[PDB]
Amino acid sequence: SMSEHSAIVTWKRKDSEAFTDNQYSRAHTWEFDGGSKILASASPHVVPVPLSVEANVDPEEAFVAALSSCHMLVFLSIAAKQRYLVESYTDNAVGILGKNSKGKTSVTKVVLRPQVVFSGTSKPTLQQLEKMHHLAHENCFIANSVETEVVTEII
Amino acid sequence: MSEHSAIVTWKRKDSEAFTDNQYSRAHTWEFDGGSKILASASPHVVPVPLSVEANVDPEEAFVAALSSCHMLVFLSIAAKQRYLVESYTDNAVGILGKNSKGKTSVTKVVLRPQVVFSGTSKPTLQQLEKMHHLAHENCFIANSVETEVVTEII
Incomplete structure (x- = not known):
């Protein structure tokens, strides 16, 4: 049958980040209903490491x-x-x-x-x-x- | 242009009969960079404890x-x-x-x-x-x- 599925996706600027130089970390979080939080990133095929984080899901x-x-x-x-x-x-x-x-x-x-x-x-x-x-x-x-x-x- | 990989794995648990349809839907996703994510069917689709609420669907x-x-x-x-x-x-x-x-x-x-x-x-x-x-x-x-x-x- 029909069902709805939610995700909260959140990114926050780190204190040290200028941001406007495009050199900010692409790390961020995905949060789901059942409580799990996943560390995410942009894909390293699209944004070079270390701006993307290879260990994180994209x-x-x-x-x-x-x-x-x-x-x-x-x-x-x-x-x-x-x-x-x-x-x-x-x-x-x-x-x-x-x-x-x-x-x-x-x-x-x-x-x-x-x-x-x-x-x-x-x-x-x-x-x-x-x-x-x-x-x-x-x-x-x-x-x-x-x-x-x-x-x-x-x- | 680019290739993106996922390894999705389910293993039958010890003593799990399976053919009764009561098996746990919990499984794993693994990505190249080393992340493993614990996954399940959605609890809005499959009741519980067959689905696992804390796992991603x-x-x-x-x-x-x-x-x-x-x-x-x-x-x-x-x-x-x-x-x-x-x-x-x-x-x-x-x-x-x-x-x-x-x-x-x-x-x-x-x-x-x-x-x-x-x-x-x-x-x-x-x-x-x-x-x-x-x-x-x-x-x-x-x-x-x-x-x-x-x-x-x-």
Whole structure:
């Protein structure tokens, strides 16, 4: 059903920061309802380190992780319902910045490369796995919200 | 132009039956620079204790990515125009609903940024509004989504 999801994003000038020289820290915080606070930054592909902070999450990385996580969650529920025992699910996902059709810089492509380990006495075939991933992509809330071409390479 | 990586991992817990659909949705996100984030399904989507309230969920992350991206472009614009920004706080909300079509997706995200300027040179409202239109135009995440993204300034 319908739901709302909030994030508080906050940046504060450090005492030592001139700011107008563009040499301010891009570190900032993301705060969510359940109480968690995440240290964030601009991507180091767009703003050089040390202005960006490599150890902190960036918007592009979070975008890729959300798409990959959303797809995973749908898949796992499908696999449980088919009574397949999943031991692990690991996705090495990659997003690409490039120019979209309108000539604007965007995340034009995301490749999901999920590797799933099954156990127990009912394991699916290659054909079945493939259909579980197609259903997962079709019912992924995040994939359904984006212009990004989302491709799954099943590993 | 650039590549952005995420490793998303779920492992079945010891003794967790899974096939009963009662498994924990907690999992991890790992990024190149070493950040690990504890993740879950949203508790507005999956009840609890199947979802874990203190963990980040895909929907929350997608709202933060949009809000964060818009902010970072805004700040570089403000700094270029020689305004001194003391703070920027955006209380963002995204809404999951149907379409367009009939598929559940994030239909609308509303950004509500509040900016504190100090010092001698401060923008007028008109200048502030223009900085936000430019930031939205140049925000990579916003240029990636089909979501209606609206900015209500202040």
